Amino acid sequence: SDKWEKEFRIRSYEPYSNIAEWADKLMTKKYSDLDNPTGISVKAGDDIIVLVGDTYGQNISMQCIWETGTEYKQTASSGDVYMLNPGVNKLTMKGEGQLFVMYNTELTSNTAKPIKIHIPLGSGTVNGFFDLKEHKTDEKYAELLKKSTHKYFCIRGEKIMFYFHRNKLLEYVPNNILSAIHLWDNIVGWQQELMGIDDVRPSQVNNHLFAISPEGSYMWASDYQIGFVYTYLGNILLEDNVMAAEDNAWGPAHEIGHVHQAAINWASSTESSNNLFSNFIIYKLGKYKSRGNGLGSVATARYANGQAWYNMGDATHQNEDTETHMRMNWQLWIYYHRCEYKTDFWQTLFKLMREVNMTEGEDPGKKQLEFAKMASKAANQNLTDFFEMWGFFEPVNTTIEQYGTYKYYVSDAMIREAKEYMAQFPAPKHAFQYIEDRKKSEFPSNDYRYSAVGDVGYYTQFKENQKITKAITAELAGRKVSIQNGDEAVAFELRENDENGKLLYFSTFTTFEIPSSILMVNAKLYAVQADGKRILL
Ligand code: NA
Ligand code: NA
Ligand code: NI
Ligand code: NI
Ligand SMILES: [Zn+2]
Numbered sequence: 001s002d003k004w005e006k007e008f009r010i011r012s013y014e015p016y017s018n019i020a021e022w023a024d025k026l027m028t029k030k031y032s033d034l035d036n037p038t039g040i041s042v043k044a045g046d047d048i049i050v051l052v053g054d055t056y057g058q059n060i061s062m063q064c065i066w067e068t069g070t071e072y073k074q075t076a077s078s079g080d081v082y083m084l085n086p087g088v089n090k091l092t093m094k095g096e097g098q099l100f101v102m103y104n105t106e107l108t109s110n111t112a113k114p115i116k117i118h119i120p121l122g123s124g125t126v127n128g129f130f131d132l133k134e135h136k137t138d139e140k141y142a143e144l145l146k147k148s149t150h151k152y153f154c155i156r157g158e159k160i161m162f163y164f165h166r167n168k169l170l171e172y173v174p175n176n177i178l179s180a181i182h183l184w185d186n187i188v189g190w191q192q193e194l195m196g197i198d199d200v201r202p203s204q205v206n207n208h209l210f211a212i213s214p215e216g217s218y219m220w221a222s223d224y225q226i227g228f229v230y231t232y233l234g235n236i237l238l239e240d241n242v243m244a245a246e247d248n249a250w251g252p253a254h255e256i257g258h259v260h261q262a263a264i265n266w267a268s269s270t271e272s273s274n275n276l277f278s279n280f281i282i283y284k285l286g287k288y289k290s291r292g293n294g295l296g297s298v299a300t301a302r303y304a305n306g307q308a309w310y311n312m313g314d315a316t317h318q319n320e321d322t323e324t325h326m327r328m329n330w331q332l333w334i335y336y337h338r339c340e341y342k343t344d345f346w347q348t349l350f351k352l353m354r355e356v357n358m359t360e361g362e363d364p365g366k367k368q369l370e371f372a373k374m375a376s377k378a379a380n381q382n383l384t385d386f387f388e389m390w391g392f393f394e395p396v397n398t399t400i401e402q403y404g405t406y407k408y409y410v411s412d413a414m415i416r417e418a419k420e421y422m423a424q425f426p427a428p429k430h431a432f433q434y435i436e437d438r439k440k441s442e443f444p445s446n447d448y449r450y451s452a453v454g455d456v457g458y459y460t461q462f463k464e465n466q467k468i469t470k471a472i473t474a475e476l477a478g479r480k481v482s483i484q485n486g487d488e489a490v491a492f493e494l495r496e497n498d499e500n501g502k503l504l505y506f507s508t509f510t511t512f513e514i515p516s517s518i519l520m521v522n523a524k525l526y527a528v529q530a531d532g533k534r535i536l537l
Helices: 002-008 019-026 136-147 166-172 178-194 250-260 273-287 295-305 322-340 345-356 366-381 386-390 412-423 448-452
Strands: 010-013 037-042 047-052 063-067 081-082 088-094 099-104 117-118 152-156 158-164 208-212 217-222 227-228 396-401 406-410 473-475 482-485 491-495 503-507 510-513 523-527 534-536
Touching: 002 037, 037 503, 063 396, 136 152, 152 166, 158 166, 178 250, 178 273, 178 345, 217 250, 227 250, 250 273, 273 322, 295 322, 295 503, 322 345, 345 366, 345 534, 366 386, 366 406, 366 412, 386 412, 386 503, 396 534, 473 523
Parallel strands: 158 208, 208 227
Antiparallel strands: 010 117, 037 099, 047 088, 047 117, 063 081, 063 099, 152 158, 217 227, 396 406, 473 482, 482 510, 491 503, 491 523, 523 534
């Protein structure tokens, strides 16, 4: 049984990067610095011997992690810290918890080597912990789990760690962790993929995300740790519980989205900008279709109701219409990525937005415009029409509430400069503001998407540059428009005078009611071809 004790009591601990630093450079919430569990539990007053080999001039320490919270209990993100020096260290635990070695430094340095640390028999208790790359098997996992005896058992993957209640692991996955750990690692790695931060990971930044099980709340993300309530873990740990319903994979991936949204996020978007990641994950898991409202929601909000981006579907200015907003980033991915007109668009755009380096709340009005401009630069196309449709070029002077209160100010002159800046790029090859990745026939009639996604503008029409080749007509009966032979178009527009007058309404349905509030006088109807050609009707 000592071969088990020595797996954990004698170990070479690798260096991990500094979290504060990389949070700044990559514009994320802070990852965890609890990358190096010992696998050793302790109790208050315990005398602990730690023998540290050569440290190469590094400063390392030991931290006891336990629990925090008044309302209920959860795993804390920091704890009692004890300094370590090369040689002999005798520590007296101020409290219970598990031990973690804090070895955080610059990774490119030739002195960033593993440090051997020996916690000799009789010092605390060996709980154990499972690492994916070194223990490799469900079988070893079960063994370690059973031998474990502490309230929490740590599981370390490549990109994420779990730090969950022992008995919940026993109750749900008492014998199999590989599926779970491979899946959550994939999510994190996918979100990280879109951000274009592969150049610096794992060579300069290598910290994990660290998932705890609070005895309260539902699910969330913050600096240092992300949380999934312990009564819910069954939908975390069993990939069949994750893959069984649409919304099981989402809510978590949305939570890891919060960690990564800052570069491209501004207040008014905080609960939608992260669902670029959410929808990317769903796409990658390969079973369900995309989430969000149809473009009819945009038209209604923008035009029947005069709203701009910041208050779309939201006259109050307090809580966000996430189901409408989330389609905006996603359309950019559908076109540039799924239709392959630029397969590293998002990676490029994230890089640019990190260079812009604006916080989410410092100036949301200007940030919205910086994002339209950087998206134009990222595509190397002038995306003025996309961003007009989405309500980026409407004046705003007010204040909003979303995790704080913020001044939202967009002026005519700000609007003017963004457009001129974006003008310097060539015209877009397609009017992909009308793109969808969903068609009606994929959904049952009780699904909200069946009625919401419209009839035209499916992504293949943009990917195969479909032309309009048919006897396309239109009949107006009261407020009801009906299009004949328009199934090759991508949308239908009411413009102000000619095909270059401002947009007054649009639809991706071939039959639709115009709302009363639209002003019809001198207004014309055009069918939009995938590539931007408008055609009078
Ligand atoms: Na080992
Ligand atoms: Na590992
Ligand atoms: Ni020993
Ligand atoms: Ni406008
Ligand atoms: Zn959220």
